[PDB]
Design a protein around this ligand. Sequence first.
Ligand code: HEM
Ligand SMILES: O=C(C1CC1)n1ccc2c(-c3cnco3)cc(C(F)(F)F)cc21
Length: 437
Amino acid sequence: SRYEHIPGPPGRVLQDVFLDWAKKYGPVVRVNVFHKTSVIVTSPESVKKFLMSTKYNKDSKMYRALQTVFGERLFGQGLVSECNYERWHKQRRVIDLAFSRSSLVSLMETFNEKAEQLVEILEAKADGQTPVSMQDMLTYTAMDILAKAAFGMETSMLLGAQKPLSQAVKLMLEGITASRNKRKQLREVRESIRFLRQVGRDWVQRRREALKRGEEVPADILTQILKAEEGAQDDEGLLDNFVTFFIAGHETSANHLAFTVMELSRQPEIVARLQAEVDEVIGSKRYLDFEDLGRLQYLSQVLKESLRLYPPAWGTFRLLEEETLIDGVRVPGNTPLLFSTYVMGRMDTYFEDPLTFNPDRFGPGAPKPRFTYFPFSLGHRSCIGQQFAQMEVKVVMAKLLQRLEFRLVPGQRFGLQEQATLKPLDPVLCTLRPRGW
Ligand code: HEM
Ligand SMILES: O=C(C1CC1)n1ccc2c(-c3cnco3)cc(C(F)(F)F)cc21
C-alpha cells in the first residue's frame, strides 16, 4: 500500500517489460524485482543525483542472490556485493592497484596470446560450412584470458579442458536467476557453488606455496585480493573476491563479445569499415600494441553502440533511505531504486531511432550522452574492470576482423536471455571463411 500511489501497472526479457512500463508510466515506476517492490528511475537528472554521490549506497537486499544461493555462500561480501561503504572502500582502494595503467599495459601479452589462439582455432574451421558457436568460443576465450591475467592460471578452455568448471559456472548462473526471479536442481546448484569456491582454495594454496618456495609470481589481481585480506580471521573474504573476479572478470566480457559478433553479422557495411580500419592500423602484424588500441577509433564506437543496445549488466540498485520527491513522485523511505542502462538505451526520449545500430552516435563530433548511457555504471561503484574489459575485447575483435569473415547460420535469433546478466538467447552459430576468400 505504501507504494500504490506511484505510477505503474495494476528472446524477450524482464528488462523489456520494464522498458514498456517506463515508456507508458514515466520516469518513476513501481515494479516487482527480485521479490521486492522497487522503483525504476529513468530520468538523467535522477541517474546523476543518485549514482554520482557517495551519499547513496547499494541496496543490500537487491544483492542477496549474489551473496548466497540456496544456503551456499557465493560472492559473499566481495567487491560487487559489499554494500557497506567503508568495507567496500577499503577493498576497492587496494584492488585498484591491479587496474593501474601500468598493470593493464602488461596484460597485452595475455590478451594477444589468447586472441591469437582463438583465431587459429577458428581459421581451421573456416570452410563456410562447419557451424561454430561464437558464444561458446568467445566465452572460452574470455575465461582463459581472465584466469591467466588475474590468477596466473591456465584454464585451457580453448583446448576443450575444464568441462566440469564450465558446467559449474552455468549451473551457478542458473541458481542466481532461480533465486531472484527441484531436488536435483538444488543439488547441482549447491555443488557448483562449492566447486567454484574450492577452485579458489586450490589456486590460493598454489599461490601461497609458490611464494614460500621463492618462485617468481607476477603481481596480478590475486596479489591485491590477498593484500586486502592481510590480517583477516579466515579466508572467506579472500574466497568471496576470488569467485567475484573469476565470474565477473569473464562473464560480461564474453556476453559483450557474443552480442557484438551477433549484431555485426547483419551489418555488412559496418563490418567492411571495421575490416578496413584494422587493415590500416595493424596491417599484417600478429600482435596489437597498446598504442594500436587507441587508433582503432571506429571499432571503439561500434563497441560502445553494442553496449547501448546490449548491456550485459543492465543496471544497479541504490537504497533510498528517506522519503524523497523524484521527478514529481513521492518515493517512501527505505526503497530500492533501480537504474537501467538497458531501458534508457532503448527509449526514444534519450536516443533517436533507438533500435538502429549506429556507431556514429559515438563519433568525435557527436554530443556525448548525458547520464543516459552507463554500461559500466557511474560514480564510486562503477566497474573496476572497465578498462581491462575494453582492452581485451578490442584485442579479440581486432584479430577476428583481421583474419575471418562470419555469416550467421539462418534460423539463428537476435533475441536476448537473462541469466543473471543479459546474453544472446542463441549460441551465435556462424560459418566462417578466411578474409580474402
Ligand atoms: C564489457 C564488460 C563489462 C561490463 C559491461 C561490466 C559492467 C559492470 C557494471 C554495470 C558494474 C556495476 C554493477 C553494480 O552496480 O551492481 C560493474 C561492477 C564491477 N565489475 Fe564489471 N563489467 C565488465 C567487465 C568486468 C571485468 C573485466 C572485471 C574484472 C576483471 C569486472 C569486475 C567488476 C567488479 C569487481 C565490479 C564491482 C566494482 C565495485 O563495486 O567497486 N567487470 N561492472
Ligand atoms: O547481478 C548483478 C546485479 C544485482 C543486479 N550484477 C551486477 C554486476 C554483475 C556482474 C559483473 C559486473 N562486472 C562484471 O560482471 C556479474 C554478475 C554475474 F555474476 F551474474 F555474472 C552479476 C552482476
